[PDB]
Amino acid sequence: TNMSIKEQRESLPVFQFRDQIIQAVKDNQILIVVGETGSGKTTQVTQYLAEAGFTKYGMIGCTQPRRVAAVSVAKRVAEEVGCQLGQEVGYTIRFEDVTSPATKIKYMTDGMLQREILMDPDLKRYSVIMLDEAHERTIATDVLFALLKKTVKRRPDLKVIVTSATLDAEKFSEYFNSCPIFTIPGRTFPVEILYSREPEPDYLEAALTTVMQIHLTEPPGDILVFLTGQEEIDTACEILYERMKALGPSVPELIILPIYSALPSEMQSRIFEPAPPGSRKVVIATNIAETAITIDYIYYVVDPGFVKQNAYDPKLGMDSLVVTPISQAQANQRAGRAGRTGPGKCFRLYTEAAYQSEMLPTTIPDIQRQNLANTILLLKAMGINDLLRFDFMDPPPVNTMLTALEELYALGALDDEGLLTRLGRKMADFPMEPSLSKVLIASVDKGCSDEMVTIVSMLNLQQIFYRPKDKQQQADQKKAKFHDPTGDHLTLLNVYNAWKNSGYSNAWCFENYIQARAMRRARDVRQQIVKIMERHRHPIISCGRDTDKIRQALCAGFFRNTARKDYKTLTEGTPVYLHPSSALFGKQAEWVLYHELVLTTKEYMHFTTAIEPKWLVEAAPTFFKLAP
């Protein structure tokens, strides 16, 4: 049984406020909890309420923005409770419902509560909902603010806790009917903040220069540096290696480790391995290392002050990944990573005035800079109509919502009055953007649903093809073996099929430079998608060698994303470019359909496939007029 586990729970700062928070949650229906980093609110508050009997008539739900945090928090809470995982304490995430009729405390992804609230608007199974990591501002969390604010009026018994950063506390309060704010101190350590005197013309080189000084002019302690992209991070490690070699073998070893989402898990694990005696560790990271990945024994942070941010342009149907200055909170999250284990220093390569007057206090929330076609279909399915007037804490741009409503109209998900159609309600069952659900349903009439479920499973995935620095040409040679003459959609089909016919081999993934993590998730998606298809009584049909049927069906959902070769978009005529990764790169194709258009260094079409103009007027008869 537990020996010293009780001491661990009572050692946490939140234990000093135990009695007071239990009182605050019986007093107030909605409550804001600000808990600084070390507080222990995540693991304890759920248990404090269960211990006070809040579990008697209702279950306790706690949302997390990330899957890994739902499982890790649930596992830790379960050991403190002393019960098997999935009994008294459980977690629910996509493809992993680890709960049983005995579960009184349930940790889940925000996304999961979003999806639950569609089938049960009053969330009858739950007595208490806690939204953890509310400061992250994930679209799901922002949606849950609005829905739960309406749910509280419907059910007076149900209690809601919402977490917040200190700066947004009063904002969140006024949103939630000016309910009270409970503050809980953390255990974090001081961090000395060093601003640059004159701004640095090259942030990459300045960051590398700062890393060398810290390694040679500072006491023992590992370094976390934040850069923006995998290619930039990969290049920085080689440059920093070359520079340390150039200095003698007299100088202490500096161990240079990249960290990014694209990186394989085996390579990711080494950043946690401790530094041999007399060595220093420098992790070169994206913003993945702000919240998502936690690295022990970090005492120095290099903050060049740049992140790659998403921004959606609805008039152009284009995402922008631009390197932009980070928010003040982001800089503070980056700084705080050196004070987690013990006291530390953070080297910001910008002026103090630049931080104070040239940096936004908070990062723009996601709901205000992503395509919302998905979110709006879900809210329509929940029976909400005047979405322009919907009660979002931070309302998204009006043009973005209007284009999302126009896209749902064009797919048949809304009628001329903007009410949800029978088709729309069906498309809302599919956990994907409407355009993909549209294509799955078009694929039944075309006789190609078997291929289309594979293709739609591969659209969801991130970093399908692995491109390591030293073996870039070897990777592209192996990728080209799968190229379909028509383009990227049937290449994804080829890749999934070759993996299946390899016996789902990790070795075959490694030898063909393909991320097994991606193929594994696609398979799990394909199984969930097939179950949804059976439920709506849509047969799974193979088109055999007749792959024109797949391309015809794709026209049903992606007609808006189309271009014609000088490429220019048919809808606006804006110039767009084939991505160098595309199976169509070297190749001629007059008419093209693309999954997504993203401005990095160029306006690049993603997953482009060659199509025939007749299919566009076949698939979308009202959205193409003919003319000589």
Added chain:
RNA sequence: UUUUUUUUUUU
């Protein structure tokens, strides 16, 4: 024409 930060979901 030469390469995308981070994350979420069936009934």
